[PDB]
């Protein structure tokens, strides 16, 4: 029944930090803080891995979050019944996101490259306006 | 243990989950059970991707065969990975490469577009404008 602390940041703009502190401040009795830099569409965190891994080895009774996406961008869901399934419950501090404008567009981005990847091998109309839909997100 | 087939079409645009089904069949001749759906990877909703979901997460299940891997989600494929390794399940692609139509591609894309141009605009983000249009010369 460990009751975990999960921060992430995309990257230090300190941020990761200063979330951590107001988690702990927050939920002042916890065991573990697993932090990550990275997206929460990077499925290769490490953090992220670690925490995954211990829920279903039925270890966590809490994890603790800032924002509904510090965890994952999508499939939030999936985690939800996850969690449920080993008893363990997602708590998340605040009920809208705060994500920084740069962590979106940044996210966007990774998401229409990987499209426009899936579109060009087969030679779709269509991968020339993903590929210049990724670099209008970037001017 | 169950071994299950799982198919999945964003439409029948008539008999394309059946010859999904039918393919995943002739590769596995010995199956337990074919849950299926219509509807996107994207949609957290599917009725048989959840009761399946649950199944592996209850132990019901020892193996998942799939055509490819975006058939079962478009994100987050590794954490069902982790969560069958965790539950004595595994995930058998057909093959490794999806093989997504045109159509479905779009579609999520735009669902995707939507979704982010909804969250630009409740932060005044002047993203906003290229994201609609992004998603504009999509449905073109």
Redesign the interface.
């Known amino acids: 029944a460990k009751v975990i602390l999960y921060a992430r940041v995309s990257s230090n703009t300190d941020d990761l930090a200063n979330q951590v502190k107001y988690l702990e401040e927050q939920v002042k009795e916890y065991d573990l803080v697993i932090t990550d830099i990275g997206s929460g ?1 990077n ?2 965190r490490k953090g992220f ?1 670690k925490l ?2 211990m829920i ?2 039925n270890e966590v009774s809490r994890v603790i979050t800032a924002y509904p996406d510090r965890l ?4 939030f ?3 939800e ?2 969690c449920k ?1 080993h008893n363990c419950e997602i708590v998340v501090l605040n009920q809208e ?1 705060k ?1 920084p ?1 740069e962590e ?2 940044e ?2 981005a990774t ?2 490259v990987s ?1 426009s990847g ?2 060009h091998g ?1 030679r ?1 109309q ?1 991968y020339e ?2 590929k ?2 990724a670099e ?2 970037k001017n």
């Open positions: 569409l499925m290769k891995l995954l891994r279903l080895n994952v961008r999508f499939g869901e999936i985690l019944e996850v399934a996101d994500t404008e979106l567009v996210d966007l998401i229409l499209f899936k579109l087969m779709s269509k306006k993903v210049k839909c209008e997100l």
